[PDB]
Amino acid sequence: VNSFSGYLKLTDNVYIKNADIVEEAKKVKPTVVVNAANVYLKHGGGVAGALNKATNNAMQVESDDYIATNGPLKVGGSCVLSGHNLAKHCLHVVGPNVNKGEDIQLLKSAYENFNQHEVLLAPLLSAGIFGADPIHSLRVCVDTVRTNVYLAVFDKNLYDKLVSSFL
């Protein structure tokens, strides 16, 4: 039993809750929170901007040093950094940005990063301001992630649509 409370079970390993991932992270302090990152780790808006704001910009400072040392991530790739005050670790995962014409097939590669962690709190990758269909993102998640994933979706109307259309 974990500290994740109030989730709906979708499959053997995938769970979902109508909540701000930031607030869920502050409450649970999970081992891993996933950030919906871009290749430059510029956490300007969406989930990333919200997570970074909750760290008082410490996530951005750490990220800028990471990029200065290592260069940009790949679309579909990830890196593990500190979770600051939100979690032990933050897994920064880059889903394809559909508004920029990036290959949506890279969404599966992005979700594969989750399999390196036994339990994660996560948003829907490539959805939101990244422009992809959230119903599709949830499907790729369920069909790719084999570890235990707790999905937080802040938008109530979207959450309702995600649940209603699942089985």
Ligand X SMILES: CC(C)[C@H](CO)Nc1ncnc2[nH]c(-c3cc[nH]n3)cc12
- Which residue ranges make up the site for ligand X (CB under 6 A)? 20-22, 47, 50, 123-124, 127-128, 134, 152-155, 158
- The entry of ligand X, Cl ion, none that residue 25 binds, CB within 5 to 8 Å by partner kind: none
Distance of closest approach, residue 161 Cβ to ligand X, in angstroms: 11
DSSP, res 4: -
Cβ nearer to ligand X, comparing 65 with 160: 160
Between the alpha carbon of residue 94 and those of residues 10, 91, 166, the distances in Å are 24, 10, 24
Quick one: which H or E segment has residue 35?
A: strand 32-37
Cβ nearer to ligand X, comparing 20 with 62: 20
46 binds Cl ion (CB under 5 A): yes
CB-based contacts of 131, cutoff 8 Å, min separation 6: 97, 98, 99, 100
Distance of closest approach, residue 47 Cβ to Cl ion, in angstroms: 5
Distance of closest approach, residue 117 Cβ to ligand X, in angstroms: 18
Judged by CB under 5 A, the residue of 80, 98, 129, 142 near Cl ion is 129
- The entry of ligand X, Cl ion, none that residue 154 binds, CB within 5 to 8 Å by partner kind: ligand X
Residues in the chain that come right before a backbone break, where C and next N are over 2.5 Å apart:
none
Q: What is the dihedral of CA 71, 74, 77, 83, to 10 degrees?
A: 40
Distance of closest approach, residue 136 Cβ to ligand X, in angstroms: 11
Ranked by CB distance to ligand X, the top (closest) residue is 128
For residues 85 and 59, what is the distance between their CA atoms, to the nearest angstrom?
10
